[PDB]
Amino acid sequence: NPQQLSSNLWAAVRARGCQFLGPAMQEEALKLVLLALEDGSALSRKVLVLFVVQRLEPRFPQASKTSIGHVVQLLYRASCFKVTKRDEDSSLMQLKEEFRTYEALRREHDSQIVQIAMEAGLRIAPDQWSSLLYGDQSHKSHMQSIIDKLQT
RNA sequence: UGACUGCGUUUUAGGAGUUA
């Protein structure tokens, strides 16, 4: 259904403890993660979330620790981090080296959402995908490529 | 039902609390 495949996607996403804040805001949030993690710094999730929230909140009041926490889980599910567990304390996390460019990181992010849609049996075309995730028709073939790699 | 806050999930995952 024309905007109800859309709300069922975000339902499936929220159910997996993840979240999409819209094309513009998601983009900044990811860039911020990269800013913190691309030089190989190692931050607990708590601190990483703080880093992003503190810069984003003043420009987007929808940006809570809770909501940004959910964006980061998207990347946790996508297996983007190198995790270092510590005894009696929280894990630190770094970006895997292959994911230290926006292009690369965003591919994985995107893929993870597609995969959630697949797990939930939601057939969605690349034209749609480019609208949902970018608000334009400029990423159809990017999204097509993601889809094809996922069914193999 | 939402929102929020912890802790957990790389052995892949949530779940508790607070609140209207």
Stated as kind and residue range, the H or E segment containing A31 is helix A23-37
Q: Which residues of A spanning 54-113 put their CB closer than 7 angstroms to strand B?
A: 62, 64-67, 69, 73, 75-83, 85, 89-91
Instruction: Please tell me whether residue A92 adopts helix, strand or coil conformation.
Output: strand
Query: What is the residue whose two structure tokens read 């999730």?
Result: A45
Are residues A54 and A31 in contact, defined by beta-carbon separation less than 8 angstroms?
A: no
Torsion (CA) A130, A11, A56, A46 in degrees, nearest 10: -120
Residues, chain A, total? Answer: 152
Alpha-carbon distance of A110 to A26, in angstroms, equals 11
Alpha-carbon distance of A99 to A37, in angstroms, equals 10
Task: Find, among A141, A133, A54, A37, the residue nearest to A92 by Cα.
Answer: A37
Task: Find, among A117, A121, A143, the residue nearest to A130 by Cα.
Answer: A143
Domain encompassing residue A138? 1-152
Are residues A133 and A113 in contact, defined by beta-carbon separation less than 8 angstroms?
A: yes
In the numeric block, which tokens belong to residue A69?
């926490």
Find the Å distance, CA of residue A66 to C1' of nucleotide B3.
Answer: 10
Per the structure, the count of domains in chain A is: 1
Asked whether residue A7, judged by its CB, lies under 7 Å from any atom of the DNA or RNA strand B, the reply is no
Q: What distances in angstroms separate CA A1 from CA A5, A11, A66, one per listed residue?
A: 5, 15, 30
CATH code, domain carrying A8: 1.20.120.1790
Q: Please, which experimental method was used?
A: X-ray
